[PDB]
Design an enzyme around this catalytic site. Structure first.
Site, PDB file in Angstrom:
ATOM      1  N   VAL A  57       1.137  24.315   6.673  1.00 41.42           N
ATOM      2  CA  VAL A  57       1.341  25.757   6.657  1.00 41.42           C
ATOM      3  C   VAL A  57       0.212  26.412   5.900  1.00 41.42           C
ATOM      4  CG1 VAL A  57       2.966  27.668   6.027  1.00 41.42           C
ATOM      5  CG2 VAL A  57       3.856  25.392   6.622  1.00 41.42           C
ATOM      6  N   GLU A  62      -5.967  28.642   0.694  1.00 43.95           N
ATOM      7  CA  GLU A  62      -6.791  27.559   1.205  1.00 43.95           C
ATOM      8  C   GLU A  62      -8.206  28.001   1.450  1.00 43.95           C
ATOM      9  OE1 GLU A  62      -4.084  28.700   2.706  1.00 43.95           O
ATOM     10  OE2 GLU A  62      -2.784  27.002   3.200  1.00 43.95           O
ATOM     11  N   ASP A  84     -15.477   1.281  -4.106  1.00 47.19           N
ATOM     12  CA  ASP A  84     -14.800   2.159  -3.147  1.00 47.19           C
ATOM     13  C   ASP A  84     -14.892   3.634  -3.602  1.00 47.19           C
ATOM     14  OD1 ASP A  84     -13.336   3.050  -0.944  1.00 47.19           O
ATOM     15  OD2 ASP A  84     -11.423   2.342  -1.715  1.00 47.19           O
ATOM     16  N   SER A 172       1.352   4.825  -5.804  1.00 46.55           N
ATOM     17  CA  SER A 172       0.649   5.489  -4.722  1.00 46.55           C
ATOM     18  C   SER A 172       0.993   4.740  -3.425  1.00 46.55           C
ATOM     19  CB  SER A 172      -0.827   5.670  -5.084  1.00 46.55           C
ATOM     20  OG  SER A 172      -1.422   4.432  -5.425  1.00 46.55           O
ATOM     21  N   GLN A 174       0.184   4.774   1.327  1.00 44.43           N
ATOM     22  CA  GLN A 174      -0.694   5.123   2.432  1.00 44.43           C
ATOM     23  C   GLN A 174      -0.814   6.601   2.564  1.00 44.43           C
ATOM     24  OE1 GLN A 174      -1.138   1.553   2.839  1.00 44.43           O
ATOM     25  NE2 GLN A 174      -2.096   2.901   4.370  1.00 44.43           N
ATOM     26  N   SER A 177      -5.038   7.646  -0.444  1.00 48.54           N
ATOM     27  CA  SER A 177      -6.380   7.116  -0.670  1.00 48.54           C
ATOM     28  C   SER A 177      -7.390   8.192  -0.869  1.00 48.54           C
ATOM     29  CB  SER A 177      -6.834   6.291   0.533  1.00 48.54           C
ATOM     30  OG  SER A 177      -6.227   5.020   0.377  1.00 48.54           O
TER      31      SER A 177
HETATM   32  B1  LIG Z   1      -5.278   4.729   1.488  1.00 50.50           B
HETATM   33  O1  LIG Z   1      -5.940   4.386   2.745  1.00 50.50           O
HETATM   34  O2  LIG Z   1      -4.388   5.799   1.944  1.00 50.50           O
HETATM   35  C1  LIG Z   1      -4.420   3.571   1.094  1.00 50.50           C
HETATM   36  C2  LIG Z   1      -3.712   3.801  -0.248  1.00 50.50           C
HETATM   37  C3  LIG Z   1      -2.749   2.681  -0.679  1.00 50.50           C
HETATM   38  C4  LIG Z   1      -2.218   1.718   0.198  1.00 50.50           C
HETATM   39  C5  LIG Z   1      -1.248   0.820  -0.270  1.00 50.50           C
HETATM   40  C6  LIG Z   1      -0.696  -0.290   0.596  1.00 50.50           C
HETATM   41  N1  LIG Z   1      -0.245  -1.174   1.269  1.00 50.50           N
HETATM   42  C7  LIG Z   1      -0.793   0.879  -1.595  1.00 50.50           C
HETATM   43  C8  LIG Z   1      -1.314   1.811  -2.492  1.00 50.50           C
HETATM   44  C9  LIG Z   1      -2.304   2.704  -2.022  1.00 50.50           C
HETATM   45  N2  LIG Z   1      -5.269   2.394   0.956  1.00 50.50           N
HETATM   46  C10 LIG Z   1      -5.219   1.344   1.766  1.00 50.50           C
HETATM   47  O3  LIG Z   1      -4.562   1.222   2.807  1.00 50.50           O
HETATM   48  C11 LIG Z   1      -6.248   0.345   1.361  1.00 50.50           C
HETATM   49  C12 LIG Z   1      -7.485   0.623   2.215  1.00 50.50           C
HETATM   50  C13 LIG Z   1      -7.539  -0.404   3.346  1.00 50.50           C
HETATM   51  C14 LIG Z   1      -6.404  -1.403   3.057  1.00 50.50           C
HETATM   52  N3  LIG Z   1      -5.800  -0.970   1.797  1.00 50.50           N
HETATM   53  C15 LIG Z   1      -4.914  -1.619   1.019  1.00 50.50           C
HETATM   54  O4  LIG Z   1      -4.209  -1.029   0.192  1.00 50.50           O
HETATM   55  C16 LIG Z   1      -4.556  -3.032   1.513  1.00 50.50           C
HETATM   56  N4  LIG Z   1      -3.107  -3.100   1.686  1.00 50.50           N
HETATM   57  C17 LIG Z   1      -5.008  -4.203   0.630  1.00 50.50           C
HETATM   58  C18 LIG Z   1      -6.514  -4.568   0.621  1.00 50.50           C
HETATM   59  C19 LIG Z   1      -7.071  -5.171  -0.545  1.00 50.50           C
HETATM   60  C20 LIG Z   1      -8.377  -5.725  -0.573  1.00 50.50           C
HETATM   61  C21 LIG Z   1      -9.146  -5.658   0.597  1.00 50.50           C
HETATM   62  C22 LIG Z   1      -8.644  -5.047   1.775  1.00 50.50           C
HETATM   63  C23 LIG Z   1      -7.335  -4.500   1.783  1.00 50.50           C
END
Ligand SMILES: *[B]([O])([O])[C]([C]C1=[C]C(C#N)=[C][C]=[C]1)[N]C(=O)[C]1[C][C][C]N1C(=O)[C]([N])[C]C1=[C][C]=[C][C]=[C]1
Ligand SMILES: [Ca+2]
Length: 223
Positions: A57, A62, A84, A172, A174, A177
């Site tokens: 929304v 923004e 990263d 945290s 998906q 990130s």
């Molecule tokens: B971000 O992309 O939104 C996300 C954040 C996050 C994800 C998870 C889970 N499961 C838990 C906490 C935070 N990050 C990810 O999806 C990251 C980026 C690619 C894969 N990834 C991981 O979290 C992987 N599950 C584990 C990983 C560790 C080392 C090398 C590759 C992948």
């Protein structure tokens, strides 16, 4: 964010959403023209959305600005997630105000025990899926390097830290990130990875921002 709370509109004023037709990653405003995010969030065609609460929304605060360039850390390793971190330059400078504001880079690394604020629009369920429209926040302490390394044997480098609760329940997830971990008014971490969300003994892992300040400063000085 799992087990967190609703931040409140514009209470986290440096939080950005990266949009390529949809929100795909978070980020942090570090000055009027530069955003820092996770290198794993890299893609072409990024519009940076500032001043957001509800990402579905238009509420009136923004600023939507296209990125003119992105720079992934020279030593980013996509397999291990070491280094990263990436910088995104906006096409035009944002207009800074009480709801849109930069966050300060750290002068020192933060220590185990420090309480921090993590925020994002990522999944809110440890098992199952529900994505919030509004920003979620979580207070979490930085964990000791030992707890971190024992939780993730062989996977934690000097450019990573763990934050959260060994007991699980809050974390945290998906979609979070690239987003900020702010401690005492300094950006100390960037949401990076985790083994699932909010599982016991598997805290979220974060890019250690204090290791990159010189790269960041240098890079923004000539770009
Ligand atoms: B971000 O992309 O939104 C996300 C954040 C996050 C994800 C998870 C889970 N499961 C838990 C906490 C935070 N990050 C990810 O999806 C990251 C980026 C690619 C894969 N990834 C991981 O979290 C992987 N599950 C584990 C990983 C560790 C080392 C090398 C590759 C992948
Ligand atoms: Ca949107």
């Amino acid at each position: 964010i799992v087990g967190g709370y609703t931040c409140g509109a514009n209470t986290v004023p440096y939080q950005v959403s990266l949009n390529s037709g949809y929100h795909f990653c978070g980020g942090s405003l570090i000055n009027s023209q530069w955003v820092v995010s996770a290198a794993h969030c890299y893609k072409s065609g990024i519009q940076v959305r500032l001043g957001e609460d509800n990402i579905n929304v238009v509420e009136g605060n923004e600023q939507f600005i296209s990125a003119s360039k992105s720079i992934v850390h020279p030593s980013y390793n996509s397999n291990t997630l070491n280094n990263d971190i990436m910088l995104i330059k906006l096409k035009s400078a944002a207009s800074l105000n009480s709801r849109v504001a930069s966050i300060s880079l750290p002068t020192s690394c933060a220590s185990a025990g420090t309480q921090c604020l993590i925020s994002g629009w990522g999944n809110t369920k440890s098992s199952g899926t529900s994505y919030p429209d509004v920003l979620k926040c979580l207070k979490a302490p930085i964990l000791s390097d030992s707890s971190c390394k024992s939780a993730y044997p062989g996977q934690i480098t000097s450019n990573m830290f763990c934050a959260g609760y060994l007991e699980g329940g809050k974390d945290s997830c998906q979609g979070d990130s690239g987003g900020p971990v702010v401690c005492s008014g300094k950006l100390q971490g960037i949401v990076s990875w985790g083994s699932g969300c909010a599982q016991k003994n598997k805290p979220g892992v974060y890019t250690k921002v204090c290791n990159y300040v010189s790269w960041i400063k240098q890079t923004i000085a000539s770009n």
